[PDB]
């Protein structure tokens, strides 16, 4: 499910066509309901907004959907030459803008080429490139209440733990090498470093 | 001037924003410090993990 | 379960997800620091390359290559924040000291 939002220009009123191009399941209702390809769902376009644009997911399926734009005629019917078609997935997301899934020019065959370029532009856009450095991301202290993504450094008990898990994780003490790097402190060489103590003799079972 | 359209430079600018506007996609382009942890022999490190 | 027309599909989302998740098209799309090791003079340092001077870590910001020019100096270099407080190993772990075989 995936509220589709947005305003289309130049188009005070119309239809918008989502038309499936496999089959769909959704396994939730008890006879597991099967959207089939082919039927075209119609949601109305009015002073240039998307009215309400309420369609079933298809990104955990991977299912493909066309997505088209017609005028309304004299009984507000969409007349079939579409104005703007294209094909794209609705991603398992609350909300996703129109904008967003619209046709673009890479294909396969020029994909990596076309990531080649992005770098270059992520590198000059000063906003992309401070929305996307990898750094330690200093967070303070840490704290079970909070949660902590991947890259955000930490200090507890004296000691720094950077975040090394891809998912979020809330109330993971820093001190588990699973989820935590910790980095450990330089050590200086030119300088006094007598510093021993806490004799309390083991036993051999430590 | 004369008609010019250009929508190729205009794709790869908008699948920029797209990741740098998606921090689960933003995570994956990050930047050259990966902690992995302590120092092993026995492991394979790629380029800017960290030890 | 699939569409046969499986090859019409390119909608920026779509795009931004594939080279974000496959790692090779990840890696192309990196910038982001590049190690070179300690600062010397000679060296030419390109973009987004990051070296160690004095103790701290500069990662240079000219946009063209710079031969000679210190990494204090802000205009085309750019320090990396550690900030740690509150520190613990710093002089005990450095003691080992030689001597002690059996006893």
């Not at 008890?30 to 997911?57: D, K, M, Q, R």
């Not at 396969?108 to 532009?121: E, G, H, V």
Request: glycine share 8%; net charge negative.
């Amino acid at each position: 499910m995936t509220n589709i939002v947005g305003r289309i220009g130049f188009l005070t009123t119309g239809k918008l066509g989502i038309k499936l191009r496999g089959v769909l399941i959704d396994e939730s209702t008890t006879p597991n309901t099967t959207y089939l390809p082919g039927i075209e769902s119609f949601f109305n376009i009015t002073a240039n907004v998307l009215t309400s644009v309420s369609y079933p997911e298809t990104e955990t399926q991977n299912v493909t959907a066309t997505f088209s734009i017609y005028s309304v005629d004299g009984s507000s019917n969409p007349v079939f030459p579409a104005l703007l078609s294209f094909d794209a997935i609705v991603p398992n997301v609350a909300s996703v803008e129109f904008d967003v899934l619209a046709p673009t020019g890479v294909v396969n065959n020029q994909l990596d080429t076309s990531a080649l370029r992005i770098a270059k532009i992520i590198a000059n856009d000063p906003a992309l490139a401070q929305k996307v450095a990898g750094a330690p991301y200093p967070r303070g202290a840490y704290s079970a209440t909070e949660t902590y993504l991947y890259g955000e450094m930490v200090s507890y008990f004296g000691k720094n733990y950077i975040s090394k898990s891809l998912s979020p994780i809330i109330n993971i003490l820093p001190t588990v090498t699973d989820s935590w790097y910790e980095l450990v402190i330089t050590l200086p060489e030119s300088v006094s470093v007598i510093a021993t103590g806490s004799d309390t003799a083991y036993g051999t079972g430590w």
